[model samples]
Target: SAKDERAREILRGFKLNWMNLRDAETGKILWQGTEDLSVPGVEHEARVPKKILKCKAVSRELNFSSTEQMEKFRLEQKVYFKGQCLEEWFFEFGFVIPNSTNTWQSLIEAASQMMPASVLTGNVIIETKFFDDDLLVSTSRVRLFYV
Candidate 1:
């Protein structure tokens, strides 16, 4: 059960800073904002949406001195089914600090295109990756809902 434990640990580290749930065609944001995920017994239900739709979420900004210090930075999203990983998607943001907005926007667009049509029951987690502790990195979280 080590793998399961690791997955749970990773999920616990996620911070729900900001999220956007929108219409895919119209590009209208239906629900968006920050949510408090620290409350006991409430974390499971906090960000649950009423309907399934396009979703985009970003974690808090990661501050770094320079791009050279960041090296290679990327965002990874892992989709799971029945405690097993189904797919893994990585979005490379390169080594820039100020350009994160445009980079992240591109990631959202890329992710939206690859999302599944329907997810009956599953788990999705997004996290950041960097070379080392030389630079700070952000963390993201996502919860899949039934249609």
Candidate 2:
């Protein structure tokens, strides 16, 4: 159920970045930006456990307004180790103003399912994108870990 205490000596870091906004059907990038949330270098003394490791990202407000009409969109997510990408995922949602908290929860839930056991090494980076719409407002959070 637990790893050797000495294994905790391994260093680990978490990085979160906002990637881009794209259309769900056509996969066209409509907007892009870079916003990073992380502490540089190894910030945590970690150990590889037999179970899943669980990490959660800070919650932030996602506010966006575009001149185009409302449409379905998908947020892209990328999980990286060191500087190399390991996985690419997506969260789809419809456009909504005052974006309901449920939307945020959905995204977090989808993100929680990522970061499999195969790529749990070195620094882990998570890059995400948001939906495209005339006006969108929501919170964002991600949970990643092993049990």
Candidate 3:
């Protein structure tokens, strides 16, 4: 009952979709954009000059199919940082179609090793497909994992 109450309290009358973001390093409030249904909650940073951010990615599942097979998907691939829509530049080559069932975790582990230690925090989901930063390949379908 307590857990349910907590869950309901957090979810009830809350925006089904919201973003979460904080500074890269200091982890301070940069900025925040929200459409939360609450009375005074409309993306404000009374919080300050810290490292303001707006909702980047609305933490919802971004769907994608092979662009080649489908040809023009009305659905757009989205990337998010907390809640902010992540930029296209973050990825190394491009979006890596997640090997959701089989190859995903292993592939990511292998790929991560190739990167330099200089790189710290970033989103892989946006970098690959949405940003199409670098790598590219033909595929049938995949689960989109936005960073």
Candidate 4:
């Protein structure tokens, strides 16, 4: 069924099973961070909405040393171990990744240590989009892809 598959895909995209912490005993979120990205005055107002990281994920990887440490961090932070046979909500990520930036190349370089030769130079722009209308999070999701 298409609906069923979408449901599973959405769930996998959410990566809920890998989430580290619940909202406390009361399911109360333990931490939250907000950011406003707009300027004070601009025609039509360059309004930037406040986006809060709901800590849907956690990690304690001390520089990606041991797989056990990474897995523990995932368990504690509500994330899945990398390269494991993942399940529903398997690919989505959360606050371990704060805000997305336009520095796609830099980010790739930082994480992979691989860069393209003779690439174009450009300024890195930080973007805080996604939950613009609602600052408070009821629920949200992020997806991961294998190159």
Candidate 5:
């Protein structure tokens, strides 16, 4: 019965599925993106170790409209973290106009003529954290949560 019951005891991990891309200069949330979501990170039939390893390192792809926009953002981020490590500054975002071929530096910029209010103000810097749960079958059973 114990051997047969092993299936019921299979370890499962919960992983957070999104990131907030922010403007490095103004410190604003520019994007909230997620993994493809079309497929599960792990499969039910997969081995525990394999699943854990996948859980260990899961990073998402970054998307931008153009090189110029990327350069502008990078420069701002550089200045934003000039005194400190350049790697540290992380936050801010922009958006595209509907039915228009234009991309603006922020949601408010796109919504400037659209709506007067921007619900989010400034920007928040968030980091990833890992928690240990020894009760799980293995270390891979642990997942990352974005803060």
Candidate 6:
């Protein structure tokens, strides 16, 4: 109660610089950094900080003789969370080679254990590849999972 307030009574000034993302050619500000960082009032109390996790590519191509040979076989894998069954939470992976007549067959052997608990809970896309934190989306020609 009152004990927590006594711990912060000595603080005077603190500077936490915020940043912004801008369009290089248009010079337009796209996004801003953290907010509500003004001086803490008497009732203000420290809380856990928010963080944005990073993502990596998990795609790899398997060697094949030719499109004709690859066409004969199809591969697909998927994963799902117990409580969370959204599109983002679900992971379905497959290999799409050019000129393949093979249909997508269930990989049934895949596991949620492939990725870490932090990543599966934090931010992870099963198919697409992400390059940056600001805009994380699908990357073309890169559809594979990695640790």
* Alpha carbon lDDT of each predicted model: 0.41, 0.39, 0.27, 0.21, 0.25, 0.27
Residue 121 accuracy (lDDT) in model 2: 44
How much lDDT does candidate 4 score?
0.21
Winner on TM-score (3 vs 4):
3
Better of 1 and 3 by lDDT: 1
Displacement of residue 93 (Cα, Å) in model 5 is 24
> lDDT score, residue 60, model 5?
27
Query: Which regions of candidate 2 fall more than 4 Å away from where they truly are?
Result: 1-50, 53-70, 98-100, 104-122, 133-147
- Cα distance off (Å), candidate 5, residue 132: 2.0
Clashes of 5: 9
- Residues 44-135, model 5: lDDT tens digits: 11112122211222222343232121111221211111122222223333332222222223221110121111211111111221112211
- TM-score for each model: 0.44, 0.35, 0.20, 0.16, 0.20, 0.19
**Which tens-of-lDDT digit does each residue in 1-147 have in candidate 3?**
664453343223222133334443444443344433122323221222311222222222222222122112121233344445543222222232322111111001111122222231232223222212221221111212222
Candidate 2 local lDDT, 7-74, one digit each (tens)? 12111211223444344334444433444332223332223332323323222234333332335544
Lowest summed lDDT across 10 adjacent residues in model 3 is found at: 102-111
Off by over 4 Å in 3: 1-16, 36-87, 90-147
**Higher-scoring candidate on lDDT, 2 or 4:** 2
Write model 4 residue lDDT over 27-52, tens digit each, in one string: 44332222221111221112111111
> How accurate locally is residue 20 in candidate 5, as Cα lDDT from 0 to 100?
44
How big is the positional error of residue 37 in model 6, measured in Å on the Cα after superposition?
49
Q: What residue runs in model 1 are displaced by over 4 Å at the alpha carbon?
A: 1-17, 35-69, 98-103, 107-141
Model 6's alpha-carbon lDDT is 0.27
Per-residue lDDT tens digits of candidate 1, residues 1-147? 664554344334433355555545456655555563222232233233434333443233222232232335455655555456655665565654422322134223324243454543344432223222223333444455544
Better of 1 and 5 by lDDT: 1
**Root-mean-square deviation per candidate:** 8.8, 17.3, 17.3, 17.9, 20.3, 23.3
